Amino acid sequence: TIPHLAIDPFSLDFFDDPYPDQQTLRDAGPVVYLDKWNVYGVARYAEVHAVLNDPTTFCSSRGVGLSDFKKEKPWRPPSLILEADPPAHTRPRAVLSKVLSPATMKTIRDGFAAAADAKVDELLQRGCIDAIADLAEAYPLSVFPDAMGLKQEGREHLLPYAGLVFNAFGPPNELRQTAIERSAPHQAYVNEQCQRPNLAPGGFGACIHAFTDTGEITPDEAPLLVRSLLSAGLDETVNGIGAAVYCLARFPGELQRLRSDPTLARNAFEEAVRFESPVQTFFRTTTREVELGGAVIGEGEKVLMFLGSANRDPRRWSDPDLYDITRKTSGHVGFGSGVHMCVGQLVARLEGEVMLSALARKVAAIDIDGPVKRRFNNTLRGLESLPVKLTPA
Numbered sequence: 162t163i164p165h166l167a168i169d170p171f172s173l174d175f176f177d178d179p180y181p182d183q184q185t186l187r188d189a190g191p192v193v194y195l196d197k198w199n200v201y202g203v204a205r206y207a208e209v210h211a212v213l214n215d216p217t218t219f220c221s222s223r224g225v226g227l228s229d230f231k232k233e234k235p236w237r238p239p240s241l242i243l244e245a246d247p248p249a250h251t252r253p254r255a256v257l258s259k260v261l262s263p264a265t266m267k268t269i270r271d272g273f274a275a276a277a278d279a280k281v282d283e284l285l286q287r288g289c290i291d292a293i294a295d296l297a298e299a300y301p302l303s304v305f306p307d308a309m310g311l312k313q314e315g316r317e318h319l320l321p322y323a324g325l326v327f328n329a330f331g332p333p334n335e336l337r338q339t340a341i342e343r344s345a346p347h348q349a350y351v352n353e354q355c356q357r358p359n360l361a362p363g364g365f366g367a368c369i370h371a372f373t374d375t376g377e378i379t380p381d382e383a384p385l386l387v388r389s390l391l392s393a394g395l396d397e398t399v400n401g402i403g404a405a406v407y408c409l410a411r412f413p414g415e416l417q418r419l420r421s422d423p424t425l426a427r428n429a430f431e432e433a434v435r436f437e438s439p440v441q442t443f444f445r446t447t448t449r450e451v452e453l454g455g456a457v458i459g460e461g462e463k464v465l466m467f468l469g470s471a472n473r474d475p476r477r478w479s480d481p482d483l484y485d486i487t488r489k490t491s492g493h494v495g496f497g498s499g500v501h502m503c504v505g506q507l508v509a510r511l512e513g514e515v516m517l518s519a520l521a522r523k524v525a526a527i528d529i530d531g532p533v534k535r536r537f538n539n540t541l542r543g544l545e546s547l548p549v550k551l552t553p554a
């Protein structure tokens with residue numbers, strides 16, 4: 162009934178080029194069994210969307226990594242939002258939704274845009290740069306920690322902690338065990354910055370603590386909710402921006418369209434999120450026997466959702482492996498879908514938009530002029546190094 166596959170979606174071979182294996186997973190059936198890790202897999206858009214939008218049947222409180230929290234201890238205390246189900250999910254989600262709200266974006270937009278324009282100006286003085294370290298990493302690090310309200314000391318822990326979080330969703334392979342092996346100093350820094358005295362006035366962290374007044378969260382809930390914004394956000398946005406630059410370098414016709422109409426910057430970034438899907442996968446756990454695409458899955462089974470694959474499913478997308486900055490991207494699952502859909506998506510889109518805006522207005526050409534190196538992570542897809550020459554407009 163259900164095809165059994167030996168593909169390891171967390172292998173370095175898979176990470177290096179996942180797209181042929183993703184078609185194999187899609188075309189084998191709507192539901193596959195992955196013998197390597199004893200989980201079910203869904204790689205077509207339809208089933209990924211269906212799983213995401215039934216949180217009662219496909220829960221997150223038993224972990225959204227391979228590990229089942231009913232069988233193993235979580236490597237860190239569970240997230241109050243990502244690793245919770247309704248109704249426990251609802252009030253922390255509402256707090257983060259207000260902290261990162263449409264109205265909040267107005268207070269940070271001008272500074273985020275200024276930093277993006279300034280970074281592109283700086284990179285044009287150098288000409289030949291690494292669009293990962295010097296741009297995709299450098300830009301978010303120049304705006305988001307300040308917007309959190311973090312002190313300057315210790316910020317070198319932020320990228321290692323994010324990489325650890327996303328490796329820890331994976332199976333117990335060497336990527337995950339090595340990350341946890343090295344985790345203690347990053348864990349200690351992050352947990353300490355979550356305390357109210359260490360979050361500067363007016364930033365995201367202080368705003369979370371300010372909500373402990375309303376009855377939506379208690380003061381003892383606020384540190385772990387701050388932890389959510391020190392786990393999420395950085396690595397995905399870095400990878401998304403790097404993907405966008407990569408695409409503009411590989412598809413010069415799309416850079417030319419973007420230069421011709423810089424108001425396409427926001428959709429250019431959204432299309433990069435669909436095309437690269439920085440978050441490749443998330444798990445759910447069944448809370449009952451369930452019929453999914455003609456297959457019967459038992460209770461307490463892990464279901465692996467291939468978000469990147471769903472975003473390139475030709476059953477849903479015209480020319481899915483073309484980067485098209487005018488594509489109607491509404492419906493892509495790069496930010497998830499449903500009750501858990503990325504609560505920080507307005508922050509991610511703002512960073513991506515103002516960076517692609519600066520490039521659209523200031524750069525004439527982006528040419529790869531060095532070896533492209535991939536970055537390997539159990540959950541994230543992104544580049545390690547992207548040597549480009551930037552030609553000023």
Ligand code: HEM
Pocket residue numbers: 221225242243244254257261389390393394395397398401434438439440443468494495496497498500501502503504505506508509
């Ligand atoms: C391009 C950038 C980003 C991508 C691709 C991305 C991806 C995702 C995805 C796929 C989910 C769904 C998780 C699930 O369904 O289990 C999610 C949720 C979440 N994201 Fe993002 N994200 C991005 C940026 C951000 C930013 C900038 C922040 C914070 C400022 C953030 C914070 C969160 C949080 C806290 C959740 C949990 C929401 C919930 O469970 O209700 N993310 N993200």
Ligand SMILES: COc1ccc(C(=O)O)cc1
Pocket residue numbers: 240241242243244326388389390392393394440
């Ligand atoms: C989608 O990526 C993440 C990672 C961590 C968290 C969290 O720590 O709550 C949320 C989303």
Ligand SMILES: [Cl-]
Pocket residue numbers: 237348351352
């Ligand atoms: Cl931690």
